[model samples]
Target: IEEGKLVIWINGDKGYNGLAEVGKKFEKDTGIKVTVEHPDKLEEKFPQVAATGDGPDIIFWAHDRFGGYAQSGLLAEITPDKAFQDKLYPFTWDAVRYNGKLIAYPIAVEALSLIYNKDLLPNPPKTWEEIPALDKELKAKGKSALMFNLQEPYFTWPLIAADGGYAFKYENGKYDIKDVGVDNAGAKAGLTFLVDLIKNKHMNADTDYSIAEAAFNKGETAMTINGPWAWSNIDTSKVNYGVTVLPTFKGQPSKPFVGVLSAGINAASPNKELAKEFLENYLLTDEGLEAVNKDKPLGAVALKSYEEELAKDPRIAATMENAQKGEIMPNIPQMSAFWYAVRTAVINAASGRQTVDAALAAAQTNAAADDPIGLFLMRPQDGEVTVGGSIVFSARVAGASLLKPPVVKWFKGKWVDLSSKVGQHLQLHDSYDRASKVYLFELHITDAQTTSAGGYRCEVSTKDKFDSCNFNLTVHEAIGSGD
Candidate 1:
């Protein structure tokens, strides 16, 4: 505990105000300034920024990314006292470790579960076999039985994973990317069940994340699959929500994807030892966790001793229980392959473009062609366009996968090119962000007007490998502002 400053970067969307409260106490007790910054896309910037020794002393992020960072020698190996290590869930320890080195301090664990409107479905089904019966019963009452993102692999994973289907086979404490089982017989069967539900009118074909969320929130659906992050938005005044484990498939429990949020020290940080002291003494302590829970309750407490207290909230309880049956999301960079391949396969079957069997088979083919060098983050995120304003869209590649200069394309229906010689409305600017060790392909749209508003896409590729991020730009006329 020295009279120095400790800086940390966290995701902009997360509620870490409690950390600030804990920081106040830390400063009072140790005379050290603890500054928490909510930066956009910290994962994309950490390694490069730290390499130049200008990064934050600490970075808070998902445990999955630590493997890549640790391999790059960017993260300091954290070895808390053995008693301190024993304070949190043992599973959480697994998440923060890479190659036998603890790279981060696990704070919270999270997983999706079946959230239902208790008044609508007083008795939630424990098996998928009851879905059809409940669908018919609910139809009489004008409510859908179940709803979830139809094409999102993250939400629909239980369907395929309940059987012998997995994105990657895990063995010897490591994931074997070469052993992708996404197209296995069990996967096909699970996908077929989902497609049949849509085709048979048991669920809506147009169900995406928002649609399903809205339906359940408005009491239009009896049950929806979601995670702890969603509880804040579940209009409790109107809908009495309850959480439970996802229903089973063929006598096997649904396996949701589990993730851990953690904080790690920057190896290059001038205050590395001090930062570790802050994490161990201020952030990882029970008092620190309490402050955060009071400000914004975590999804699930990783501290085994603290879980029971937080589990008093039924949502937290069910989420914690769901994690017991969940699969730890693969932390390796190769996981990007599973996401893209399975998502495409799910969409193909859901959209009637292919049979369930065909789509799953195609997933395997697509997974095989995947390159680890994929787009990890996108800037100028999907949103409405600012009329008559210039905008820039950026796609950031993963640091570990940095290779050749990416071939970049800015798309609007068809790929577009704006020449600088005449009346060009668009321009391209690409750069290597060395501080973050990632390549940035930026598309700049200048002098944008109503006519320029539409869905825009940026695709970055290296030889045979490709990745794309898209934005839906909407246009609206301001009152009294004539075109």
Candidate 2:
């Protein structure tokens, strides 16, 4: 609890030292010392650490993860003044929100772009159909024209969604979980394109990001489907590269997932106002963003003030072109299922493990099987309590379609009888927040003894869909016990 300091945590790729430079300026101007941290396993660690009331004041990452974080009550709602909001690209606003509430500030927007070696191909192809001819030309020179991770859902989404394929249907400003389009005709068409590439040997079924990245760096590949983050890992001296929007598919423009990187305040942070000021007036401003771009080059800035400056960098402008045409990556919690289902389909189809149609159909089946309202959080991840100290466990579930209060129940070996009340020493508390579409449930065990130590589980169900989480409680015997 330093009096005049702010802490921010970011993942490795998000530029750590670059931000530290900006922090120095912020401190120089505002007299608030800023500490920037690059944490390991940030996506998993942030929530657990924040719940314990100890985490960085500011956190930076892609917007998609915010929806689940918001549901777990880990983020504070950010109400940027309308004037400040208007300065940012309109599409970016949606990325920072979850269920109509702004939980973060969009700093930059990014999408997959066709990154090609200028020395290899002076002109990049404009369509997937054009790759074959280019591949032939490069093959004679002992190189390939294109190489990318074929089975990664995020990287391969341009092919799948360029036509009419989609993961969840968006209708009237909300996603409909019932209308998953994984096995649709449009999706099948996209998969067929990949299947053709594999059979034709233009692309490898075994290729992943690591393999493709290595080949591209060695100049063995003329082009790769990648985004701005790829540049940090690339050997810039070896490959003279250029970035452009992805090639079209059957006359339809390729639509990569648009991801907005954002900075958000932790709900538990004591210096929330100071953190927000740093984001709004410092980090996201023209000068601040320029400093950030100089070091890491986010590829596309969200602020209109920085757009004109960014246009000078042709590679960055190309990414913005792709981002403007891309679809916002869904930030809902159910997207967890979509990623797994889509990746499985991609691998199955690419490896000849299953036909495109069969793989897509299986994807649809798997997606539909996921719980609409999945568990978001369960407190005291490591369950432990001293005897007679009141054992309490709290759980939450979040979803887009949770209009009705879900059927929530607690179980200890078997269903606990809420009415019987566990010898009058138990209490059940539950509530739902319509704004965030989150449901909270809790079980309280008072005057507990060694017998209170056991497994505890919470289940949330809606009609046919259900999801559950569990933890084991260990009662310490060092203290006195109660019967």
Candidate 3:
């Protein structure tokens, strides 16, 4: 092998130090000069350097944000050699592929799992709903149940999935926004379970990562939902801490956003081909995987090597069992909407102002509505308008069915249907104010037609009589519209 210099930029001192050890070994084994750069504030430094086309040959950062750099063309795209691609996990390789191009070489993969103090929680809760019950039991014993960083949305995605919800759809070998499962019945129920735990004082809302880790170290908090990154810093001797896959809910296990950090050669480099060869032989090799796994113990993305090593470590085997349910954090450019919506929804749901249903709905709505596919209109109903003449109208038009049901609005201090409520009748009061109405009436009709020539027509009738001199008639459209 010929000698070459490789400069790598990394996020913080911790990552820099870890990579420094790897760099020394890489140089020793391959006779390549590897320089590791630790910039103080990478969030600021990276963008500046990348914008100027002066970034390092390889950089270490979370794959979650790699989409942005890949989008801006600030990152290099490298087609993995066949030998390297064959050895990588399908999900891990997919994480580096953006716009049909393979851009990075994964160095490590991190995923979430439940970590508990073995002395307190001999068995982890098997489901998300059981968390509260477990908490209650701990509280009875004069100890807190569990602690999570309710303020951080990243920490909550697994919990959301444990309830059978996902931020996006996984189909056709790619991720795309489809159903807002977070607002679905299952997700809301799961969130409610978490909220009830906090509200009933079973869990602590004020607790965050630092607090939780401290409590665990001090044996004050029994367990927490976290990743292997936490394991590196946690004081293992103070309490008997054990790891388990985050439990399931509704028979579905929690699928965390698994993140992979990899190396990539700068496309503009003078030695791009040689750089690729170096990465191929050094990073993706079985021996390379073993070296990294031995030090990190978070498992490896090289599937072949990981399986071979896992046979010897039962703890790692259990972690892998939990992680198989995980997903590669999406590297799509449009993932910004997902991150924002998820973080907003989860945080708000964890807080009190919005119910889990409302928070998740708002988040999903915001994500879907980010790109408007059609138009929306608002209309008024009969009671809002004064009726001086006899005009027959029906709230439900016969043979008129909704293609997509509009959501009920919890605005104006009550629940109002923005669209037709099938299988149920809409009750209209004489007055716009529901409390002030003297009597209620239901609108029934048959054979309705929307004439292209003008407006809607139906054979309209009412179950009760409205005083001709005092009644007003109107129909109202809901807030959101467009397909």
Find the candidate with the highest TM-score and give its number: 2
lDDT of 2 by residue, 324-439 (tens): 77788888866767878999999989999999999999999887675434445534354677777675566666645645666677777677644355557788877766655666
lDDT of 1 by residue, 355-471 (tens): 888888878877656444555543346544456666655555654444556666767755654333124767676666554455566566667688777777667666667766667
Q: Which TM-score value belongs to model 1?
A: 0.69
Model 1 lDDT vs. the true structure? 0.76
Provide backbone clash counts, one per model: 3, 0, 17
Top lDDT: which candidate number? 2
Q: Which ten residues in a row have the lowest lDDT in candidate 1?
A: 414-423
Encode model 3's per-residue lDDT on 394-453: one tens digit a residue: 121111123322221211112323134323332222211112111112232212222101
Better of 2 and 3 by lDDT: 2
Can you give the TM-score per candidate against the true fold? 0.69, 0.78, 0.66
Q: Rank by lDDT, highest first.
A: 2, 1, 3
Ranking of candidates on TM-score, top first = 2, 1, 3
Model 1: residue 32 alpha-carbon error in angstroms: 6.7
TM-score between candidate 3 and the true structure = 0.66
What RMSD does each model have against the real structure? 7.8, 6.1, 19.8
Alpha carbon lDDT of each predicted model = 0.76, 0.80, 0.58
In angstroms, give how far residue 337 of model 3 lies from its true place.
1.8
